[PDB]
Amino acid sequence: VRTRYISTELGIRQRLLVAVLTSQTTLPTLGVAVNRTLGHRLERVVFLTGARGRRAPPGMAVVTLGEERPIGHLHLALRHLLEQHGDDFDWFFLVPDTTYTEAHGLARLTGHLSLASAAHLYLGRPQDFIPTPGRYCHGGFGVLLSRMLLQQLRPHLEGCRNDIVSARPDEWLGRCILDATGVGCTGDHYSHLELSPGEPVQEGDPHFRSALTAHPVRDPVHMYQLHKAFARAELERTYQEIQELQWEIQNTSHLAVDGDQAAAWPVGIPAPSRPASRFEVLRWDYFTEQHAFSCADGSPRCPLRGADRADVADVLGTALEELNRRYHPALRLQKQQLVNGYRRFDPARGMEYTLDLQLEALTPQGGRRPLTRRVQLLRPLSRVEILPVPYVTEASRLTVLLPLAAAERDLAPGFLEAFATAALEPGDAAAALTLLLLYEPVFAPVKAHVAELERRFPGARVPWLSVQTAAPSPLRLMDLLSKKHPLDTLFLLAGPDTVLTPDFLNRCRMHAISGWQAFFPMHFQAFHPGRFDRQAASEACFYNSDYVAARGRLAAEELLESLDVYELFLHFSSLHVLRAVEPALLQRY
């Protein structure tokens, strides 16, 4: 018999389960703080509370126990941990809400014991009893029980509950463990951190480097600060590990096939891509501190705007900080000027820089001397993350619109033919066209074409309305169309010069998320009776509800008259405004 997974064959259980003990009052604040500081770094977290006062917080495995007395609460928590879960985990961590958990340190600890050796373990901070020389673990510092210990403890829970008269619950647990199995609290190492009352969290303290619990925590803010400090400590540890790995790669590089490729700065990051042909070379984008000379507009130079300027300033600051750190304390650098600035994006490596800085050197005595240095910065590409996105179905009811003006009657048949070949000819009635007539203060061919389409495709139906009002302002017409339409239809605002294709229809259907995103493509402009125009909105793919919300935000007349629908969604909307190129949309004039 053969299995698809090792877990079934070898009986592999999950590593660790954390059982946070809380109460009715301490759940919505301290339990939530514990969840936000621990649950996203672990696998399974179970919250045990005596009673459920309010509704269970979302994403919180809250379990109602029944009693608030600490001894009975612990007894019922152990009963639940044995009945449910139970023989599914190798280690159980019982920790009160008032104790921060390091998560990473706890996982490292649990991975640092073997099943064969620590079969029956009672882990925690030892504490003296109050004749037996055994010691029990302090409740506030977390207790890491073993599965076998819990199984042997099961038939003694009620016996321990009904005989001894201890006050503290952790002392009761220690007494029960001692009287049932005989093993006390083992100190190993369990790196515990104790906090004096009313203490300020001092980041960078040595005790933050090696500690898996912190007791006592009385407010969620204190827990949050402790978690931030421990995150800083773990970050420093990770930086040290990265340095060690880089050193090992540098040591073993020159014996490998890659050689210089393996030992290419920075050590560990993928080597720069080697172009195969002339066209595949990567061009450095020159920029000064004021203007960028590689403009997507087309101009030879253009002042740095937004993202580019912010990136340049950040890179200059990083370079100055790194130089000051490297030359400290012998030399401190001064006001920095960017003589030459280069930047290219290497898809397999990351964004690269090559700066030529005109720095100034200040000796501690006070000497002044200008200095010119060249530095290189690389932003490595990290792992790929799949962003969550609302589910969108391929088959969506789409309503393509057309504000057919007076002068576009000649070109209207081309749009009608394109729409027919794109949606009406396929059997599925996935699209419907509701064109508008701008009867400015005589369109028989358009109605005849619509009737011909209706007769040729009996299922297809195309309506039309006669806007007598002038002022064809995109917003105005869009409000009228939105008013005379349902609030959940998918809107495809297509200009007269749009040649629809089934591929573009599918892309609009599956990239216009209701209430999450609006799709604004850019067509393929061509010269002479090509280019991707970036200043033309024209085609728009959004939803009626989103447009109504944007119009309400606008309301809360000059903007209504001189605002584009794309500009409206840009300003008065918090929706993704994806502006991508469409090769399937060809335009010409």
Place this chain on the structure above:
Amino acid sequence: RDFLYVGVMTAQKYLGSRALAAQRTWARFIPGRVEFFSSQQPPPPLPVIALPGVDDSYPPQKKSFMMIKYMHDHYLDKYEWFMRADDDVYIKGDKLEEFLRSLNSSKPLYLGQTGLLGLEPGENFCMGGPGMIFSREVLRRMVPHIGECLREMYTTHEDVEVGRCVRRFGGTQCVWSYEMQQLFHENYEHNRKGYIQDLHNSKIHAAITLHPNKRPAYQYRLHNYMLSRKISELRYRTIQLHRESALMSKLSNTEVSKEDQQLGVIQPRERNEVIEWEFLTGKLLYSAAENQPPRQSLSSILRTALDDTVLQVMEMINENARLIDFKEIQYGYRRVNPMHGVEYILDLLLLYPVRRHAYLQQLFSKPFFRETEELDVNSLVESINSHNEKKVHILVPLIGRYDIFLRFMENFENMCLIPKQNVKLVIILFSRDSGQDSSKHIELIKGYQNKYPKAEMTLIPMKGEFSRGLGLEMASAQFDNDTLLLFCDVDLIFREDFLQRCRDNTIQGQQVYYPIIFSQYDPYFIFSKKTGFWRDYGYGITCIYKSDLLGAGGFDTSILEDVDLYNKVILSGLRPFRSQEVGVVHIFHP
């Protein structure tokens, strides 16, 4: 560090070839002690154990038995797991440590890939290639009968015999699970050569032990790749820690630090601020930037990056296992934020034949830093308390054009000679019809020569028809291979900024400067749409070292020549530095 003890078997001919590599490759990451075993000899590069009565004879039969006997007799109670492995195997210490820690060492476990002689069907043996791991109990129950197993030898395969010994004494067979074929990879169905070549396979990433690795250099390459993967994982961990710190400071009603907000990122309003996306089909790319051409073919760099991204997506999608398979990309989108990361929208065609979107994101980790030329800090401070750069040789091929010549040299003298810039000017003049403008050019050159007697101005009387390549080649041939040569043009005007950029951007043996010359439109340094445009297709101007030019093979002198030199430079391994050049503008000419 008493968890895992792996004893790797070697041979006298493999001590300095595979044993040393394995000691410097994965013995430094095994959570425990790694000991090398060889045959008895009548200064080895490695500390090795010579098992008595053992000879280097393939297959390594009874050598594994002796090494297991040594394992039990020396470190039975000092370790929980014992691994028998060949020298041509790669073992990942951390993954194996977690996988073994998820197991009970006190139960008899005989791990390894299933092997499918004298096998009555129903039993099996762990294959000796990927690596077979025993437990303490298996050792304790088997090793008293190793001699008995050796005296009942049936087959000529060592791993079959070891599995038979385990089954006869140890109460265990090899693991039957199909997951072993992935964890302990054999890498023999493909890659027949015998050394890992394709490193970007999901099988390589998901495996624990990789075999075979006969070539030591490829073993080092695989080790470097694995360490690079570990570094990338650690960088992602740093990004996650920064995100957590930023969120945690937000919760505590405290201002986030600068290092935690840029890396802790989870409407643009203005029209020219939204970053446009690019269409990515299976083998074509469409862009909206003026610099990029629409419908450009998908570059090999872009193809490799997309393949790696799709591989990562498949790895992080099949983590919930059914087995998802990737076929092709119907279309895609890409938006490169310079300071944050890269956003993808891939419409994959996955197989469980169902399409699935993926709004990917590839953030940037903490930027790295390096100074190109480190300086002596100690020697600098004493100097502070208390033009002589690299000479640029200007080569100017010529034919006629008296007025442009005079304008060029007026600019050259005004910008170099009076400032005494460290340059050498070489005038390559083609004496068309053997005279005519040559005499006046010589007179002007001589007058400018004695006007500035410290200047370096030389004219070479070329003959024959017009040829940029031939004149440039013979002008260069008189200079040594450590000289900086500039392939300047007569109808050009430049300042010292261009000279400094040429000096810095040209690395002897590594980099070639290939500026994008600004060509003035038909009616100065003011850059405007009407004034001129960037000549992307112009590779005429070059700042290249003589040795680099010789290595590129020089000009063909048969025909466009600049494009051929660019291609030869690319093929030679040099790095072409293509970028804008704001220090020199090409004056218009009919």
